[PDB]
Amino acid sequence: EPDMISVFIGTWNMGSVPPPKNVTSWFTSKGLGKTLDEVTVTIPHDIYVFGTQENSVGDREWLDLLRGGLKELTDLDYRPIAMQSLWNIKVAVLVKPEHENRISHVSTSSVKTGIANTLGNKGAVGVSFMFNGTSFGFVNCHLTSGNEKTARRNQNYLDILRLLSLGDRQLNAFDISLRFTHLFWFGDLNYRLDMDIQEILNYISRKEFEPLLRVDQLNLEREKHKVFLRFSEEEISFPPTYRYERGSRDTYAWHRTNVPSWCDRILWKSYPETHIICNSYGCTDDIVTSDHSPVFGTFEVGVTSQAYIEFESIEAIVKTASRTKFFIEFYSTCLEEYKKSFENDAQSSDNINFLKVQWSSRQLPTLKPILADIEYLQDQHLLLTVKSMDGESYGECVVALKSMIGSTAQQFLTFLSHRGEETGNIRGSMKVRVP
């Protein structure tokens, strides 16, 4: 029935002590940054997702605290659809009672990413599900600490990306960056500021965040295309959330030392031509039990209620030295089974590192969707993987059917990726024809 839903994401490193009794500000996006402080009448969200780190409250008691807090806030009995914990890294997903019958295909997963000669218990936990016909993944993580450990954090990220098993077994050809309509990845990512302490404190007291954001390690690693390929993060207008003295937010704790940093982050990655708007991204300033401040993010998200596809041609530019033949596998929830193309019938290159690979219409199968309703087909997506004939994918991508419905073929162009690396691009011409 609903066209759109409101999704809340919270991330909080709790610093190994229990929460204060009142965490209302976290739930309602009140504090610093892009906030919902103007809102006078709380509009309860459809889904609340809580990711925590250094959470030393027993699992049952923690879930009870959250459910109890939401009950008091909303007067609704929110339904925990899933929880997953790995050491003190814990995620929970709660939904309005009315939505319980809209949820299906729930899975959870965890991944350990321990590095020698460092403090352990790092990794990630995840939950995925369907809300009617739209799929969601949520990843909560705690990555390697330390100013000098950027490379370790990047490897943690890649290991989580590769090993987290959320979602359908058939989507094994893809990693979690392409398994869901909407993927939220958050946690104590532990990336720091490349600047000395007194200089950082100066900019924080001036509320001049741009010079700090320029030396944020996460931003810098994303710019290098090493992590979070084509994810989004809302603009940061709140002060660094680590490391505070407990009992107030007036003073940062300090021993390059453990400099104040945006450790705690929310990013997202969505299928093309979908509706998602970020309505808040911020931190609280009245929750003072931990050396981190809680971070909130909220999102309005489109949801879709639970014929043939013909290509004129496909051309891929693939980052590879191989000169063999290639084919494509096509997957989608709108297909009864996955389909495969024939060998490419043309290829060329004037670059030792790249290859242009082409499939004419003849080399490409028509795909048959399970339902011919225009409104159904508009919300669907195709997942493509480019494979060699000898056989391991060279690149995956997603293509939206939204603008392709009709009699004449339409252009598409998108990026190929594999294991967190950009591996080229793919383009073509296709249509989704209904009788």
Author numbering: 420 to 674, 682 to 732, 746 to 830, 832 to 875
Excerpt from the publication:
The overall structure of the Ptase domain in Ptase-C2 is similar to the one previously reported, displaying a central β-sheet sandwich decorated by seven helices (α1-α7) and several loops (L1-L4). Importantly, a loop proximal to the active site, spanning residues 674–684 (L4), was in previous Ptase structures disordered or closed over the active site (hereafter referred to as L4-in conformation), whereas in our structure 6 of the Ptase-C2 monomers (A, B, C, E, F, G) exhibit a conformation where L4 points away from the active site (L4-out). These L4-out conformations are stabilized by interactions of R682 in L4 with one or two aspartic acids (D613/D615) adjacent to helix α5 (hereafter referred to as singly or doubly bound L4-out conformations). In molecule D, R682 is half way between the L4-in and L4-out conformation and in monomer H R682 is disordered. The Ptase and C2 domains share an extensive interface of 940 Å2, resulting in stabilization of the Ptase.
The two main enzymes responsible for PI(3,4,5)P3 degradation are the tumor suppressor phosphatase and tensin homolog (PTEN), which removes the 3-phosphate (3 P) and the SH2-containing inositol 5-phosphatase (SHIP), which dephosphorylates the 5 P to generate PI(3,4)P2. Importantly, even in the absence of a localization effect, the C2 domain provides activating signals to the Ptase active site, resulting in a significant increase in catalytic turnover.
